[PDB]
Design a protein around this nucleic acid. Structure first.
Lengths: 96, 154
RNA sequence: GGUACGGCGGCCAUAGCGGGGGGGCCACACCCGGUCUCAUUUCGAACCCGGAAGUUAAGCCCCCCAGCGAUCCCGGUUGUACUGCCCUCCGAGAGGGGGCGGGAAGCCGGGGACGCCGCCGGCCA
RNA sequence: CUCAGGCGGGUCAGGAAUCCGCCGUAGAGUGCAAGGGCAAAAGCCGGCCUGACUGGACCCGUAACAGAGGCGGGUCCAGCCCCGAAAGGGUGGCCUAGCGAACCCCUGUGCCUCCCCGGUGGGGGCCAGGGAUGACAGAAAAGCUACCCUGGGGAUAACAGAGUCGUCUCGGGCGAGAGCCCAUAUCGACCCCGAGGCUUGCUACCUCGCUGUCGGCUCUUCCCAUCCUGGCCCUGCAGCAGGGGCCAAGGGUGGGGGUGUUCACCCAUUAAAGGGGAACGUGAGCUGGGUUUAGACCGUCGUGAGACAGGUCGGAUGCUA
RNA sequence: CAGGAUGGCCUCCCCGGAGGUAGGCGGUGGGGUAGAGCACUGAUUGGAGGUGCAGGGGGCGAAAGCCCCCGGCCUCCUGUCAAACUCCGAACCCACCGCCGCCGUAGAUGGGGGGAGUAGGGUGGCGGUGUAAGCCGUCCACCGAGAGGGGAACAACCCAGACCGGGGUUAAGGCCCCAAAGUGCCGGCUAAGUGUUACUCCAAAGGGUGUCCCGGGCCUUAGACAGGUCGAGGUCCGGGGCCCCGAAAAUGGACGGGGCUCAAGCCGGCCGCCGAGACCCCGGCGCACGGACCGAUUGGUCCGUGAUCGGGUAGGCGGGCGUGCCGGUGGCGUAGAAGCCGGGCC
RNA sequence: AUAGGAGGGUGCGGCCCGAAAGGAAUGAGCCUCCCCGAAGGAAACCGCGGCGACGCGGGAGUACGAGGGGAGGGGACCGGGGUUGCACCGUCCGUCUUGAAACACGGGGCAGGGAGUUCGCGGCCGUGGCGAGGUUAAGGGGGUUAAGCCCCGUAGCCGCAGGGAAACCGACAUGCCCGCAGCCGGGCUUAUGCCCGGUGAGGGGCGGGGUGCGAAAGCGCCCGGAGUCACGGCCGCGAG
């Protein structure tokens, strides 16, 4: 039986959280900032349901191309085409 | 050091990754030899393509003989003593010795192509082309024994 | 610059839980009383207001431990289980094996671990 | 403010009513499936309110890569507002389901417009909400054909072949148990390992511009897992006989009753009256009793046409090698 | 649902100018499969200890109640599990960076335009299902659309990817004859024609003082076993190689065949030779790209580079051959046109 | 008339034909001699290693080697063709199909005939004319044996201004930044060539403007001049 893709389709372990990590995260990730042209990983935080990108892109590295409101604009390369995402910084991580 | 790499297996039943690795190594056909460096990148390429090639360390004398016999210029012209002396001021033996010791690279002979198209070995390979040289075949790392194969293939 | 002083924080258990000893310059507490501010779906129990008669018993602060929990290193099991590539290598079969490249989990033994950092003030100087 | 569950105490009060302490990482709840997330909360109790709003921009998913009407979601600007001391939050439910084109019609609201011009009744147009297509990217929709016809298909069933052997026939391993004692004279529970392709089944590989069905008659040939005939071994083999096994395929394996029957049943003989393969051997050899067209009767089912792996009567067999 | 449309995959032309990434090394991040384990959820054999807990059997009752088996719940010990479990967890894969390597100014990556064909796939490994065959996906390796050399023939297996004429050496594999090359060499095993099978395309459980070996325990060279007398190794156990039994089919017949026994079989190795269109060399043709010359329209000559050009189905593009008629140009023919049979040359 | 394969392929040998158009007495098959020689490549003989098959060093990169040249002798065939012999290889042709020699379909032989044509509309390209303009249709005049040839014919069509359902309104003849080719200056460089700096048509990014929706912000479309006509070709839709 074919099943169409939904937001939380086959994310039982991907969006799960460690038992010792329960609760809200530390505020550093919430309050972090990035600059245009920076490269950032996408690590979704399950406990924060706003500004969440599609779990399809969880674990990918993108480029910051601006910031509207509180969310950052991340440009990513899916296959060969370009996709723009709006992600809250809590879901993002700097690339060292 | 400098490593000599010879392609053993043919162009059929080879998957795209290994095919591209060999193409970038410039081993497009069988019985073709190249000389490369001993850097980790090249070692990784050899590890990736280890099932269709053999390789080892090449002596200065064997390198000189290989250059003199199978070395070809642009246009498939022979490498002559006059040309080598004119463009470097040294004999082929000294050129090979310096190349092996690392003073300079083969690329410093103008209009020299990187591929040597060797001849099939005299008496053939002493092992099947389906097993590694360690087991008794003809593939994989060969060590300093690749000089004997180079001599049997000129 | 000293201080068994506090406030705001970072990593968020190698920091926790549970035990033993010690202290009150200042400071933090317990503690005393509910006119006013504030509140009990009753209760000054909590929250709020007004203070210092008393106490270091508790919180708090300093030192110690390996009982539970967590987690770091070393040795054994062990290059074991598993696995990427090639194979005219062995098997009736299931499945194994050679070469090159990676490599656990748990358990046993010995150490570690009763937190480490940032900013600014109080008291003394 | 902190839950479920538990321990100890307390008048009625008991396992369970309401209460007082201790433990308690969530073992509770969060409207509903499951997963994920939630502890000074997203849970329980209260105060105020209606951001479940208006005008718009961009982006992701359905539909990766890689095209999309419709739809869902995310990030924001402005307007008017709600809570709060403030920060901050609010474009429904903590996230993922609960729904739908064209044409036409109804409602709201301000505008444009109707053939030379102007007023009136009415109509047409733009924007927003609504009425549905579950076959859910959206026809308005019941059957028989055995009187059937056409174009195709071995892309696809029935007979036959091929693969497989669940099933079927046959064989083996251990030996509980039965055999007066004695597992193995004979039987061999439970369990386990195999052969054949002689029953049935499964697959859909060849054959639908045709490879003519079952049974019977005629005729030829082959296998042994041997029914009789030849030769032997063990015995719970006194003889006459029986039970089990081995070697052996030269020869034999017949005649009749009902039924189309293969088969099975029965009769009188017999040394015995064995089982099977050959396109389930053999229709350019035969017969045509059954199956399987077109006619007709009965039972049952259907409103009806009509149907029945339900019965019954009749129903064609081409040939110059 | 034997059919279409939008995409993916092929081909031809153009613009636009300086980068791109199939492979590798290191780094920054993501993951929960294999394996493993019981810390959550749910299972699972027995033993010990503690609990009236609204079990149930009984003894034990005017009622209040206790005395034991048994059921449940908790802790520990013991023996086992999970596709819809996880306190842990690889190989490996993915995104991004820096570098090596390769491609690109003879113009890549990328963008616009014209034309398609393709909507039945198969074999091979992996995953779910099924007794199996098979069905359905996944991997892109081979056939489809692929020559040549082999496995006896074979779609898929091995070598190998192919313009033409020559010379040589190797590949798969092979060397007793068919059949090119050894009745080749060293140590050992099999007595069954077992075998003479890389795979397509090869029967097991159980058993064997049949043989060749390797370990371990008891005795242990006039002292052991068979029959207190002999008088040298005996008696057991677990293993390894080959072979044997278990082993029955239908036209006469299959190691491809003959046949082969210190093999012409098998185990561990070695030494020569034979063998492709593959690889090397010589001469020739075409194609792609760049360059120089001449011809009054698409054309011609020559030079340079090619290990990184030369198979091909659907399909795309370029050039050329041939036929009837027309406008021009230059001609042939009764001293023999067209047509027809045989032959020479390009 | 003792021999097996889809009737053929490669190589040559018998028998036969060979005037012309192919070579050739200005000399064929053939015989003899000399030189160079790619990839490749021996052996005799001698010394040594291995139990052995055998191998190593000298001989030697020698003899030989595809092919490339020269000289002498002889004097008429070589190339080509018909049939057949031998060695090895080879299971016909078209077709659907995953798979054809197929026990899948179409295939006795020969000769002639036989299947992407025409119009209308739209999208592209190859070339040519004119160019902010392009082009004529119906038709008219001249000339002519004639329907050819010459001239006129502005109706119409498309382009020049876009936005909006409509009413209706109504824009850059360049204000900046990068920058390929090209040009200019300099350096390296025998020359082509390479690097740097400036300017840079075309191309790209901003800024500004018109209109629709909007309270506005802000968005969609459009704006700094290239179109039109013709011949040929590919495809799309409708006609058989």
């Amino acid at each position: 039986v074919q099943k169409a893709h939904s937001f939380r389709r086959k994310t039982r372990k991907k969006l799960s959280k460690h038992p010792r990590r329960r609760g809200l995260p530390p505020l550093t990730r919430f309050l972090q900032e990035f600059e245009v042209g920076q490269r950032v990983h996408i690590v979704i935080e399950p406990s924060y349901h706003k500004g969440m990108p599609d779990p399809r892109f969880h674990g990918r590295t993108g480029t910051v191309v601006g910031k509207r409101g509180e969310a950052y604009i991340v440009e990513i390369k899916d296959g060969s085409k370009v996709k723009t995402l709006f992600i809250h910084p809590v879901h993002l991580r700097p690339q060292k | 050091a400098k490593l000599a790499v010879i392609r053993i297996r043919g162009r059929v039943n080879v998957k795209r990754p290994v095919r591209d690795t060999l193409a970038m190594l410039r081993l497009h056909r069988v019985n073709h030899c190249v000389i490369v460096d001993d850097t980790p990148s090249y070692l990784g390429m050899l590890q990736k393509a280890k099932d269709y090639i053999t390789w080892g360390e090449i002596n200065a004398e064997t390198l000189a003989k290989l250059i003199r016999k199978r070395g070809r210029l642009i246009g498939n012209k022979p490498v002559t003593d006059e040309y080598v002396k004119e463009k470097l001021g040294m004999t082929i033996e000294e050129f090979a010795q310096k190349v092996v010791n690392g003073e300079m690279s083969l690329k410093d002979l103008p209009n020299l192509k990187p591929v040597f198209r060797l001849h099939p070995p005299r008496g053939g390979f002493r092992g099947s082309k389906k097993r590694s040289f360690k087991e008794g075949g003809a593939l994989g790392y060969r060590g300093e024994k690749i000089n004997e194969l180079i001599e049997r293939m000129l």
